[PDB]
Design a protein around this ligand. Sequence first.
Ligand SMILES: NC(=O)C1=CN([C@@H]2O[C@H](COP(=O)(O)OP(=O)(O)OC[C@H]3O[C@@H](n4cnc5c(N)ncnc54)[C@H](OP(=O)(O)O)[C@@H]3O)[C@@H](O)[C@H]2O)C=CC1
Ligand SMILES: NC(=O)C1=CN([C@@H]2O[C@H](COP(=O)(O)OP(=O)(O)OC[C@H]3O[C@@H](n4cnc5c(N)ncnc54)[C@H](OP(=O)(O)O)[C@@H]3O)[C@@H](O)[C@H]2O)C=CC1
Ligand SMILES: NC(=O)C1=CN([C@@H]2O[C@H](COP(=O)(O)OP(=O)(O)OC[C@H]3O[C@@H](n4cnc5c(N)ncnc54)[C@H](OP(=O)(O)O)[C@@H]3O)[C@@H](O)[C@H]2O)C=CC1
Ligand SMILES: Nc1nc2c(ncn2[C@@H]2O[C@H](COP(=O)(O)OP(=O)(O)OP(=O)(O)O)[C@@H](O)[C@H]2O)c(=O)[nH]1
Ligand SMILES: Nc1nc2c(ncn2[C@@H]2O[C@H](COP(=O)(O)OP(=O)(O)OP(=O)(O)O)[C@@H](O)[C@H]2O)c(=O)[nH]1
Ligand SMILES: Nc1nc2c(ncn2[C@@H]2O[C@H](COP(=O)(O)OP(=O)(O)OP(=O)(O)O)[C@@H](O)[C@H]2O)c(=O)[nH]1
Ligand SMILES: Nc1nc2c(ncn2[C@@H]2O[C@H](COP(=O)(O)OP(=O)(O)OP(=O)(O)O)[C@@H](O)[C@H]2O)c(=O)[nH]1
Ligand SMILES: N[C@@H](CCC(=O)O)C(=O)O
Ligand SMILES: N[C@@H](CCC(=O)O)C(=O)O
Ligand SMILES: N[C@@H](CCC(=O)O)C(=O)O
Ligand SMILES: N[C@@H](CCC(=O)O)C(=O)O
Ligand SMILES: [Zn+2]
Ligand SMILES: [Zn+2]
Ligand SMILES: [Zn+2]
Ligand SMILES: [Zn+2]
Ligand SMILES: [Zn+2]
Ligand SMILES: [Zn+2]
Ligand SMILES: [Zn+2]
Ligand SMILES: [Zn+2]
Lengths: 495, 501, 495, 210
Amino acid sequence: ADREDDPNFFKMVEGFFDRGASIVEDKLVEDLKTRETEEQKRNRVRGILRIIKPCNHVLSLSFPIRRDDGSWEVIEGYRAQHSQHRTPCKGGIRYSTDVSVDEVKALASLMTYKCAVVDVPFGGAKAGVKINPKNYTDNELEKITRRFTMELAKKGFIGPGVDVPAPDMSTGEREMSWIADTYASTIGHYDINAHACVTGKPISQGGIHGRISATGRGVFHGIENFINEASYMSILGMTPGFGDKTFAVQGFGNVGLHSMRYLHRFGAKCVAVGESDGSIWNPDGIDPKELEDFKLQHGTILGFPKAKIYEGSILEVDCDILIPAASEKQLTKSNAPRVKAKIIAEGANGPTTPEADKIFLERNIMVIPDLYLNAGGVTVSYFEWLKNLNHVSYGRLTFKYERDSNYHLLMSVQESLERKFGKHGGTIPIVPTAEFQDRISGASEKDIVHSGLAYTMERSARQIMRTAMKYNLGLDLRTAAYVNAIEKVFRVYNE
Amino acid sequence: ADREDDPNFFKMVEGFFDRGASIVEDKLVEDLKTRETEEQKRNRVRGILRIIKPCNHVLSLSFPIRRDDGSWEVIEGYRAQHSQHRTPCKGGIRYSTDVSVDEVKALASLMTYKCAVVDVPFGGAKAGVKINPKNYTDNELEKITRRFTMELAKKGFIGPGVDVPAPDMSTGEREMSWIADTYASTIGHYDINAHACVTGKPISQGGIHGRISATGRGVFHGIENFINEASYMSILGMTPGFGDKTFAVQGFGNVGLHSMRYLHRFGAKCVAVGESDGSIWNPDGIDPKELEDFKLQHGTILGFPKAKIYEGSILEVDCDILIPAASEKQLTKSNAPRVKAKIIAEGANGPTTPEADKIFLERNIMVIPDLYLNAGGVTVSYFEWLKNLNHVSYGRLTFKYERDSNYHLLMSVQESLERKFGKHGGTIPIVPTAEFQDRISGASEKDIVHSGLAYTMERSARQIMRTAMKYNLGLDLRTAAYVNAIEKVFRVYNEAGVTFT
Amino acid sequence: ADREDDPNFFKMVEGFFDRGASIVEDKLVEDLKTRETEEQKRNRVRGILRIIKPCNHVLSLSFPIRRDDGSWEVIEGYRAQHSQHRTPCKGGIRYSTDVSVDEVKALASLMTYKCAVVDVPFGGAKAGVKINPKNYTDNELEKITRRFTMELAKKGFIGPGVDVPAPDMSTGEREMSWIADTYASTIGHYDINAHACVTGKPISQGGIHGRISATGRGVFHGIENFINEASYMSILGMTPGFGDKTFAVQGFGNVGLHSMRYLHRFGAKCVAVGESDGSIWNPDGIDPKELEDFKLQHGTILGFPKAKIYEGSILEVDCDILIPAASEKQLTKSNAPRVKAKIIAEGANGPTTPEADKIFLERNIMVIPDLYLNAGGVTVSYFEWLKNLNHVSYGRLTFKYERDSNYHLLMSVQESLERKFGKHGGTIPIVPTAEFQDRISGASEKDIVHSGLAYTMERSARQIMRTAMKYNLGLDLRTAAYVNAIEKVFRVYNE
Amino acid sequence: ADREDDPNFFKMVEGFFDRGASIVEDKLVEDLKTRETEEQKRNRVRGILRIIKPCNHVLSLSFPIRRDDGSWEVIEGYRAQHSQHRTPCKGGIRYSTDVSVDEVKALASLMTYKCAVVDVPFGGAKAGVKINPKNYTDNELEKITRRFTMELAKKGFIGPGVDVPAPDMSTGEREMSWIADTYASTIGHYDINAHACVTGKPISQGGIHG
Ligand SMILES: NC(=O)C1=CN([C@@H]2O[C@H](COP(=O)(O)OP(=O)(O)OC[C@H]3O[C@@H](n4cnc5c(N)ncnc54)[C@H](OP(=O)(O)O)[C@@H]3O)[C@@H](O)[C@H]2O)C=CC1
Ligand SMILES: NC(=O)C1=CN([C@@H]2O[C@H](COP(=O)(O)OP(=O)(O)OC[C@H]3O[C@@H](n4cnc5c(N)ncnc54)[C@H](OP(=O)(O)O)[C@@H]3O)[C@@H](O)[C@H]2O)C=CC1
Ligand SMILES: NC(=O)C1=CN([C@@H]2O[C@H](COP(=O)(O)OP(=O)(O)OC[C@H]3O[C@@H](n4cnc5c(N)ncnc54)[C@H](OP(=O)(O)O)[C@@H]3O)[C@@H](O)[C@H]2O)C=CC1
Ligand SMILES: Nc1nc2c(ncn2[C@@H]2O[C@H](COP(=O)(O)OP(=O)(O)OP(=O)(O)O)[C@@H](O)[C@H]2O)c(=O)[nH]1
Ligand SMILES: Nc1nc2c(ncn2[C@@H]2O[C@H](COP(=O)(O)OP(=O)(O)OP(=O)(O)O)[C@@H](O)[C@H]2O)c(=O)[nH]1
Ligand SMILES: Nc1nc2c(ncn2[C@@H]2O[C@H](COP(=O)(O)OP(=O)(O)OP(=O)(O)O)[C@@H](O)[C@H]2O)c(=O)[nH]1
Ligand SMILES: Nc1nc2c(ncn2[C@@H]2O[C@H](COP(=O)(O)OP(=O)(O)OP(=O)(O)O)[C@@H](O)[C@H]2O)c(=O)[nH]1
Ligand SMILES: N[C@@H](CCC(=O)O)C(=O)O
Ligand SMILES: N[C@@H](CCC(=O)O)C(=O)O
Ligand SMILES: N[C@@H](CCC(=O)O)C(=O)O
Ligand SMILES: N[C@@H](CCC(=O)O)C(=O)O
Ligand SMILES: [Zn+2]
Ligand SMILES: [Zn+2]
Ligand SMILES: [Zn+2]
Ligand SMILES: [Zn+2]
Ligand SMILES: [Zn+2]
Ligand SMILES: [Zn+2]
Ligand SMILES: [Zn+2]
Ligand SMILES: [Zn+2]
């Protein structure tokens, strides 16, 4: 929302891009070894940079639905694909009334830069259907999801090797299940990869472990990597580690709740949670599980016992870490001054506007940009896609073999230690650590999701941090990120 | 593009539809014998129409091209598909800087209804690439139109059973030629109907006789059928025939030049011709050839020796028939009062605003509506598609059979007569008249394109007259054309038993 | 053919399935989250089950063959596909005159539950062709299976992502190689996975190590996993292990032979072999490699030097383990009373009728059921399909790197120890044991085939045992299997 | 490219092949356990080697290129597919005026055998374009390698599951980046593995280290 700082979402992310585009400009220029030198290069660079920014394809739908009561209602929807520099395109399907071609455009672009930060080989994309799901029956919501999949399918805006959609606001397993089902029942009847057409699926339908809670978990890993970095924690004026920290969470959805779950888990105190009808609060702590229970029970977080109803912008709560996990453009120049938190964890997609970004920097609020924080989603969606493509549960073929080998490896250290210390040593049992015993059959699917996500969110955190320090962006983490997203994408477009 | 009457093209055309949807609502309801009677009758009518109105699909593209000097430039373009109630979608590609999503949506809807009026079984579509072709080389234009065909091809917005493009403003044969080749050379390299993927092609690449000229030829018939409906020539205050009549045309590309040739030929005097940089005028007349000649050499019509450069909007020139045949929204509430013409033939696509539309109605100016008049284009496009689907030129297999059969038919008349009138009659030579001698091998391609277009514009015109009189619309020819369009498209959504569930 | 207990195969298998369902009906109901509680919980469950029982599709075929002699012959055939809850369907091709639509239907249903038991991601399907393969030429058997492949191709009853057939009775490597070719020749000419359209292929033609041997090798594992659980050999009244044990095998084909090989390899004495023209028998042992050479050289077992022509049902031979490894409905209400063996290992497909299952139950005779026991097949079939998908022989790219990794790994233990124990140790070599020497390069293909199979069979063995006890089924191992197969297929059915 | 020791390239490899095939012919017959043994095995070995030697498919192309001066030039080109005993076929693209159907047939036969030596699961294939790339501009070269690819794809002579090329003399990363792009862009937009339609590509376009 916010009426004086409601930039057009696409141009806004275009802004973030352009910014980062400038600081690399000299770097990218000097990289490229084009013989025709001088400034034919500098044009070449903003020439390529001028193709990256715009979306390649955007598909607008109007299709009819027969409502439950029997009337005919026409549904509109869009899907934008921002890049093909990596095939296929990846991106969520969101069901809200805010959906416009433009927010679907900005979201898609965001997805391209996102996957670049996080070394996921997808071009960005995104869909939206202009319905408030709440206002439709489950049966209607089904018809809408299916017909919208048929439209995307025929015009080639879904398909495992074209465009793998995924969840977003007001969509989850359920919908992806229908998407995956009408795709694979019509267009995909022959595709050996028909169920790699969408991600976020029920595990029972092709899904992967922890894909619901994966963007939350990646939020945590993203926060952790910085909060445990003394360089930024000096500058910020706070203690390393999660132990003393308090945080608030805007939105209690897929990334809202699970961000709370993992942050609460490793020691952070969740004092407040908000939703579209109000917030709640308690600086002695809200427990995610109790709150989740109460919310599933009473469809609302409000009136939760162990926390008062908080009157006012939950974004402005006193806390260490502010985590927007709702829609975009919520921390703006209007309310950026009075935010109170020292770390903004952009769990949501593009939730703080550039005007706010400016205040936050000279206020020395640290913004972990959505670019890097909520990529835990595609990264596991990339894992889910890879699972579908490989047609095996990770570990299935190697569990026993790895179990046995580690055992004989361990045995070799033993039989060799006894071969030397004849009997002064005696019999020297070499046994797996309790933790190496969990790790003894090799990585299961779960293990890959957990560890692969952790590696990802740190390897990327490091090269963001390194790029902040190489260009002296200090706490403008977003600008280092785009600098890395650009650098990686630009490398494709010229080489 | 006006300003203080610059309505949204797509919504504008919705209004033209909505107006006719209301004249028919009672009839559609009456006809529909859904047992579920009463008003859930009406609502299902109201509900169907709400499904006819929006475009089904709209594709927006950004793609780069390597411009000739090595620079990269990002080209944008769109194509909208209004309806599938008939397949494929049919509609043109337009290269202007006016090209927006909302334009391309309006044009599309306009093409759906246009086909319903003239019984051409196509849903409506239309594309635009947002460039000024006058600013790029032939090389860059080729690059740009093929990539567009590529980008359309991949997402299902070009294809013979899917969506057959065509020429519009600043595109023609040359572009269609590239569009057919790039399509047929990639996505279509095994399609037996690869080249039915677009109309407006050169004759030599699958094109049909007089496709270029046919939109204007259609304008001609469409004016003829009304200007000789004594009924309407009465109310208008004119005389039947083209005989004394006088006309001006906005535009001198595909639709202007040929409407001008064809009216000139059947006696009407052309007194003015406009293009973007200005107009030229002469009440004694301008010759369509000399003007075309002058234009092909000089790049403009301004300076044509046998005419004065008019100062002021060609739409206001004193004539009988003004022919908007340029871009849309040229006749608005600003300039509608000042039109001097008594018949406006809407050769262009959406040239009249609805506010201007009321003014002409109130001013007793009969606007032949786009819906009907400029349908010459599709109808022959539709023939070009039939031509590609059948992989024979018309007649090719029956010419010698028809000739022989006719000769033998006539001989039967003769021999039978001679048998009766033994010798008081003698030999009674039954010979083809001169004109039947031309028609004696049956129809050539050109014959079909000519006679079939004629049939379509006559049949649809009387349908439009019959309907305007039944509903006492008088000179509201546009809504009568929309009341027909709706009746037909509605018939399709209705009889379908359902549509989906 | 038993003239007084020949249930229609499909209904018979529906009985097994019905049986298991009413056991978990209460279970499926309680788990089912459904807001709409009550018995419209029960009825959705039973409706879903009512969907699972019937085959989704059946293709009946008539196609002419011109015989070697130049005459015309109308060959009938069938493929039934029972479930698509996993794509592709999997299942063998059978050449017999027993092949009827109802038999094919039952076998296909048996495939979907079979893969459910062993966690092989395939819906089930099965095809037969109503021929006596003994009555046709190699050339005629090629025209037939090639044209059958074409009939199956053109109607979507074969394809690497739609339905992957494999061997069964009177088909094998040589027929699979034709199917694979005929498919990949035509339809699949562009398919990167044309060769994964069928399993059982020769190894040079995309096949996998030990897939001929795979099924009985799993018969061995499946017996083994049960013959070593004291809980079950107690109840039985037998000693654990293969040590003292004795078995007879109906069928000496691809299941019978290798079942007999591997059991023999690990102790047990094979005392009877039988086929369709008789049985042999020798209580002191029938060596499998001998019987093979003799079989191969004589096209029969009867009159094998080292055994006597047994007269009387091989199903009633005195032994510990009876292994039906031929056709279905061999063990029926008439002769189940007279079976004498304590463990019936169903390597065949549906060898035991339900009335005979009942008799076996109350006679305290443990029938290890087809559903689980002969799923060694699909499992190794699964492995090859993946092999074909992954376009690499297992280990090819990692052998050298793993070798050096382990040597440096050990070398790390060596030098770490020598750094501590300066010269009080002196030189402390750390070397692979012989067993870790063999694994020191990582798993070969056969490594995976062998350990993957074994893993699959022990794990599936357990979850059957686990189910039996929780449901107090005792020896009704079959109902335990169906209960897992029903459990697993259900739960895919979520919208 | 010599004088009086310049054998037909294809036959020169057939020569090598034929030699190493008598060395094993005895072994192959002894191997094959066919029940109709005899010389009816010696010859069914003779038949099988007779099918291996000749390329299964050769495609000769003439296609036009608009040169940079505007003129039209008919550019000559070939890809031979030696064997499908493993799909897809594998083998490079050579830009040279020595390119002939026999040279390219030979390089093709050399490539299946090269992949057998190192157990690379591809039947051999090779391609040549009869041009001398020092005489052409990069833009021309691009115009060529792309149009060559479009012709290859429509006739089934490139494709990740059917035939995958690679670099060779006067080709490399750049032309690999072109082929990949024109195939993926046209014939295989829906093909998940489109960019596996050729090897040697730039690291950034799907290529590999080293
Ligand atoms: N995999 C993913 O889901 C990923 C999501 N994101 C971004 O995360 C954000 C949320 O995704 P998700 O959590 O899945 O959406 P959900 O539908 O899962 O839940 C979203 C929550 O946000 C609340 N909300 C939305 N707008 C506001 C607002 N203006 N003020 C207060 N509360 C609000 C909703 O409340 P109510 O229910 O009352 O409307 C709901 O509780 C989106 O912006 C998405 O783009 C980023 C990366 C990955
Ligand atoms: N098949 C067809 O071609 C059909 C076309 N139509 C409609 O007819 C109209 C034109 O079609 P077409 O003739 O093909 O397009 P063209 O590309 O042939 O150019 C038409 C003419 O319009 C002139 N023009 C453009 N804008 C203006 C303006 N603002 N004021 C005055 N003159 C102007 C151009 O002059 P300059 O070159 O100086 O811009 C040109 O001479 C469009 O609306 C089209 O949709 C209708 C039916 C079928
Ligand atoms: N991968 C596989 O092959 C799998 C097979 N199965 C099941 O195992 C059984 C057979 O498999 P397979 O070994 O492949 O079949 P085969 O074609 O290999 O022949 C099986 C054996 O059964 C014998 N036989 C057939 N009918 C009778 C009969 N009425 N009485 C006695 N002996 C008979 C045959 O002898 P004769 O030559 O005299 O008929 C032959 O020795 C079937 O139920 C099959 O579905 C289970 C899992 C997988
Ligand atoms: N809503 C909700 N989700 C949960 C809860 N516990 C676990 N999950 C998520 O649901 C999935 C199943 O949980 P587990 O099987 O225990 O897996 P896990 O990786 O050990 O769970 P976590 O480490 O907490 O993410 C995981 O992705 C969890 O993140 C819970 O109490 N409520
Ligand atoms: N632009 C332009 N087109 C012309 C001219 N003369 C004829 N044509 C068109 O080119 C095509 C070939 O002309 P003709 O072979 O005479 O065909 P036609 O049907 O007899 O031509 P018309 O009856 O004059 O339309 C027809 O579509 C004509 O409309 C001209 O002078 N200028
Ligand atoms: N039919 C048949 N198969 C055999 C015979 N000997 C080995 N095999 C199978 O043929 C395949 C190739 O054998 P090997 O290369 O020796 O591999 P293996 O994994 O050691 O096979 P196993 O002896 O079962 O452990 C394996 O599946 C063997 O089971 C035999 O004598 N007859
Ligand atoms: N032509 C050329 N290639 C080089 C040079 N240095 C490295 N490369 C190649 O660049 C690729 C990446 O090289 P490096 O990043 O140095 O890593 P590498 O795997 O050690 O490569 P090698 O030095 O060949 O062992 C490898 O293919 C190298 O062979 C060089 O100086 N000239
Ligand atoms: N839409 C999610 C990612 C969804 C996905 O591709 O899995 C995001 O904005 O990051
Ligand atoms: N632009 C033309 C195209 C007709 C066609 O050829 O489809 C029209 O609006 O009628
Ligand atoms: N007929 C085999 C099929 C095994 C396979 O799919 O390879 C079975 O019953 O399991
Ligand atoms: N053309 C090279 C390599 C071919 C390839 O990489 O496929 C050769 O002669 O082996
Ligand atoms: Zn549609
Ligand atoms: Zn997890
Ligand atoms: Zn594109
Ligand atoms: Zn004509
Ligand atoms: Zn047939
Ligand atoms: Zn083995
Ligand atoms: Zn060609
Ligand atoms: Zn290297």
